[PDB]
Design a protein around this nucleic acid. Structure first.
Ligand SMILES: Nc1ccn([C@H]2C[C@H](O)[C@@H](COP(=O)(O)OP(=O)(O)OP(=O)(O)O)O2)c(=O)n1
Ligand SMILES: [Mg+2]
Ligand SMILES: [Mg+2]
Length: 903
DNA sequence: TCAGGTAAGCAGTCCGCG
DNA sequence: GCGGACTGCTTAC
């Protein structure tokens, strides 16, 4: 076995490292690491160390890390650059693991835990920890066991032991329905008192010390609550046993409004799953409660109980403990699906950072680039201070609002990273500048050629062509990984569609799902076998295919996110390689590329159609073009196609055989114009969109920038069994839009695009008539709630008070005095409802914590005073009015001369 | 909402617009 | 009532 680190820390002049040794065993060591830093030196001094610009450096080897840090300070005092890796544990990892790390996840202890705390007087604050911890469930990935620590005796009630037998039984049997597959994995430990529970928990923790520590809100709640509670009962030294090195730090996390505390446990890598989910899922959710996310991710029912959670232990200890166990399992279930832990480990070990640093793209890239440059004995520059300066980004074309019947789209592959590679944009590759013409002049190829020597961006920057910069080199490596995983994702997607087709004609038989790798396109043999399978086996295969697609999505999109993160890091003042010249070189080239190719595609299609000056490109955003294909379809004639799939094939062939070579010629010319190092502008066909053949559907529409809908039949080579709606920006896509309203607006759009005006009018009429029956939560708007205190003029709305904040203030007055009433949390999200005039709440709206039922203290009055009319107009009618006017449709049948009863 | 980036949409407040 | 200046929030990329 090749060795790999688990955790690394600097504590004074020592590195503390936990690691897996050559025999696969977990060990810990203290190393008195002597760091090196660098200073510029005269050419007269023979050296093997050079900075990124090729200037010679002397290496200074320090007696200890404190000496090195002090030297950095004195160098600032003198006014001289202190070069090298100033984060010493990153240098330590680089020296200790001077190879591509291969890690074995089976040896890494991943701990998932959740605690329960009964509190009669509101939310139990982690920084006070004034209430007993009465349950802990702690899952250990190495043991594959759920360790349950259950407090039987508390000042808030004495209870009986939890029953695994009742826990396993169905809810319909009066049981808790703890999943059958974890029942035999539960190790249950009841405790007479809290001191014994906590002492035993620490002994357990010492035996099975987490490397990766996760759960739901563990960083903001569970960890600080456990640490502070132990601290309160036993003292500080005992609480610090949560750290393998007995070192902890209270860390103050600042935001805009804006501060909270966490506990850093040295020698542990905390990856709170809520934060992993927020970074890696690419969702924006109305609520981030575990119940909400679990329901969204797994389609599992909410954990049902009677009364408040503050009385659950006393009234139903059995359910209390079962739900604590289930809470831990649901995070495991989400991860088995999303694979964010696996992703974090992959990224972390690739970069050679503390695993928790994956949350920082700057730290991630700083380490990758340092390791790369170190291999060539090059020396990284010192991070400098920079004022924050705004800079220009992408071009977005203003579309003409309209219906668009036949649409084909194209999108540049990893644009920004591709620009970096093509132009060779890097700190050490800057060759100089050239005199800029207006962007329009480059777009139209009338400007003077920037350089005959160097590779250029239209922002005025020139780059060397003799060798690749470190940024192009390293971005290429991660890009290639992304490309591989996207390949697996798309194959699984295509494979899913094959299964969906078979599900139309399932064989009536008893059989098993096929053992197949869904990351690769099914062979003919597999395809034949699939057509002979039962619906039960096919649905299981579909589930597996979709789980494979999810796994591939996680791996690809977040590698895409990482490489795009490097382009953005160049525009962040804290990045070691911050340079607005390089950040703007990328964005400005991107603007030119889009508009260059818009002109080229327009010219090509005008030529092939035998027309002049017509706009075929209807829209573009950053690196995409949307092309009107009406004229292409019309040249062969609607009536010449057998079915929808026939014209989809035609457009697919047209894109591949005609348009793609034209796009490529256009970009090859642009590459020569800018004298770039390597042509890397690859613009794959994305969507083929249109109405079903023979229908009255409109196919698509745009209302404005970043606001459109398309009926897609093929997306990047995935031919759908059923057409899929691609809706961007519209209210159906916004977490702020009520759930039921998203659903209704989506159906209106479906009818518009697939069936036509009449079908849309029928549905509108029905929804308008029935909507007052919808559950209040389904028709509540959602909003983040920041700056509640600012607009609070005890306790009424101050000047310019936002609508949702007014709602919260209404809520606060209506629950005033109640210690048990759920409190709106600053920075979190609320449901919002309008209130009818003359209501007992004294204002026009009310808001309460999102993902929850409004407290029974006021529920009936809210339900009675809900303004359904205002609700409908604001969330449904107004957006729909926007869709239909853009599409030139009416959602209500206009009067005609035919209106003499007989239609 | 600690944690790479910019562009740009819509809701709402305030208040002008004879 | 619509829209402009402005804040707040949320999306596309
Ligand atoms: N969060 C984001 C999203 C996008 N972009 C920029 C960089 C992208 O390269 C460009 C185009 O966005 P795409 O969504 O088309 O993503 P890519 O082109 O990078 O990848 P691909 O199109 O291959 O999926 O926009 C960004 O800086 N930050
Ligand atoms: Mg792209
Ligand atoms: Mg794009």
């Amino acid at each position: 076995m090749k060795e790999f680190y688990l955790t690394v820390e600097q504590i004074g002049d020592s590195i503390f490292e936990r690691y897996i040794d050559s025999n696969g065993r977990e060990r810990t060591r203290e190393v008195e690491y002597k760091p090196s830093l660098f200073a510029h030196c005269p050419e007269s001094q023979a050296t093997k160390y050079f900075d990124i610009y090729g200037k010679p450096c002397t290496r200074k080897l320090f007696a200890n890390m404190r000496d090195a840090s002090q030297w950095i300070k004195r160098m600032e005092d003198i006014g001289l650059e202190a070069l090298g890796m100033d984060d010493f544990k990153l240098a330590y990892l680089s020296d200790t693991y001077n190879y591509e790390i291969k890690y074995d996840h089976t040896k890494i202890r991943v701990a998932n835990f959740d605690i329960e705390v009964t509190s009669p007087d509101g939310f139990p604050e982690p920084s006070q920890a004034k209430h007993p911890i009465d349950a802990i469930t702690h899952y250990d990935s190495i043991d594959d066991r759920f360790y349950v620590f259950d407090l039987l005796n508390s000042p808030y009630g004495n209870v009986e032991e939890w029953s695994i037998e009742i826990a396993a039984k169905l809810q319909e049997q009066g049981g808790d329905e703890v999943p059958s597959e974890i029942i035999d994995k539960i190790i249950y430990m009841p405790f007479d008192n809290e001191k014994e529970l906590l002492m035993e928990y620490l002994n357990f923790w010492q035996q099975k010390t987490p490397v990766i520590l996760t759960g739901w809100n563990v960083e903001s709640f569970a960890i600080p609550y456990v640490y502070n509670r132990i601290k309160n009962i036993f003292g500080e030294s005992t609480a610090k046993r949560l750290s393998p090195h007995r070192k902890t730090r209270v860390k103050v996390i600042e935001n805009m409004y804006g501060s909270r505390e966490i506990i850093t446990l040295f020698g542990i890598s905390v990856l709170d799953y809520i934060d992993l989910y927020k970074k890696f899922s690419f969702t924006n959710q109305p609520s981030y409660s575990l119940d909400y996310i679990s329901e969204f991710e797994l389609n599992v029912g909410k954990l049902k109980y009677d009364g408040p959670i503050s009385k659950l232990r006393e009234s139903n200890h059995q359910r209390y403990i079962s739900y604590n166990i289930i809470a831990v399992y649901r995070v495991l279930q989400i991860d088995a699906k999303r694979q964010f832990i696996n992703l974090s480990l992959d990224m972390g070990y690739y970069a050679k950072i503390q695993i928790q640093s994956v949350f920082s793209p700057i730290k991630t890239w700083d380490a990758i680039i340092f390791n790369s440059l170190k291999e060539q004995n090059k020396v990284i520059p010192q991070g400098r201070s920079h004022p924050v300066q705004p800079y220009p980004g992408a071009f977005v074309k203003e579309p003409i609002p309209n219906r668009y019947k036949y649409v084909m789209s194209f999108d540049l592959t990893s644009l920004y990273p591709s620009i970096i590679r093509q132009v060779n944009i890097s700190p050490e590759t800057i060759a100089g500048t050239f005199k800029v013409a207006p962007l329009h002049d480059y777009i139209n190829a009338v400007a003077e050629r920037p350089s005959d020597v160097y590779s250029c961006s239209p922002n005025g920057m020139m780059y060397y062509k003799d060798r690749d910069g470190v940024v192009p080199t390293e971005i290429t490596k991660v890009f290639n990984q992304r490309k591989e995983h996207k390949g697996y994702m798309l194959a699984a997607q295509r494979n899913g569609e094959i299964i969906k087709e078979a599900l139309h004609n399932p064989n009536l038989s008893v059989d098993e799902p096929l053992d197949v790798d869904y990351r690769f396109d099914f062979s003919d043999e597999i395809k034949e076998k699939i057509k002979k399978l039962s619906a039960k086996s096919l649905n299981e295969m579909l589930f597996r295919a979709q789980r494979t697609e999810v796994a591939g999505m996680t791996a690809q999109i977040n590698r895409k996110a990482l490489i795009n993160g490097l382009a953005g890091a160049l525009g962040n003042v804290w990045f070691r390689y911050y340079d607005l010249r390089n950040a703007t070189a990328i964005t400005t080239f991107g603007q030119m590329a889009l508009q260059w190719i818009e002109r080229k595609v327009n010219e090509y299609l005008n030529e092939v159609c035998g027309t002049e000056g017509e706009a075929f490109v209807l829209y573009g955003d950053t690196d995409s073009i949307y092309v009107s294909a009406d004229k292409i379809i019309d040249k062969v004639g609607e009536s010449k196609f057998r079915d929808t799939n026939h014209w989809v094939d035609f457009l697919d062939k047209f894109a591949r055989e005609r348009m793609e070579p034209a796009i490529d010629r256009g970009f090859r010319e642009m590459c020569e114009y800018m004298n770039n190092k390597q042509h890397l502008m690859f613009m794959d066909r994305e969507a083929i969109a249109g109405p079903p053949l023979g229908s009255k559907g409109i196919g698509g529409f745009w209302t404005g920038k970043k606001r459109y809908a398309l009926n897609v039949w093929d997306m990047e080579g995935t031919r759908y069994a059923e057409p899929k709606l691609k809706i961007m920006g519209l209210e159906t896509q916004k977490s702020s839009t009520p759930k039921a309203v998203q659903k209704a607006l989506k159906e209106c759009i479906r009818r518009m695009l697939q069936e036509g005006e009449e079908s849309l009018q029928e549905y509108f009429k029905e929804f308008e008539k029935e909507f007052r029956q919808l559950n209040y939560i389904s028709i509540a708007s959602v909003s983040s709630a920041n700056n509640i205190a600012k607009y609070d003029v005890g306790g009424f709305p101050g000047p310019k008070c936002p609508f949702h904040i007014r709602g919260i203030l209404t809520y606060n007055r209506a629950i005033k005095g109640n210690i048990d009433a759920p409190q709106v949390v600053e920075g979190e999200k609320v449901y919002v409802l309008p209130l009818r005039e003359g209501n007992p709440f004294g204002d026009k709206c009310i808001a309460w914590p999102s993902g929850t039922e409004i407290t029974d203290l006021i529920k009936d009055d809210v339900l009675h005073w809900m303004d359904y009319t205002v609700l409908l107009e604001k969330t449904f009618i107004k957006p729909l009015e926007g869709f239909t006017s853009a599409a030139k449709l009416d959602y209500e049948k206009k009067a005609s001369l035919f209106d003499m009863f007989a239609f």
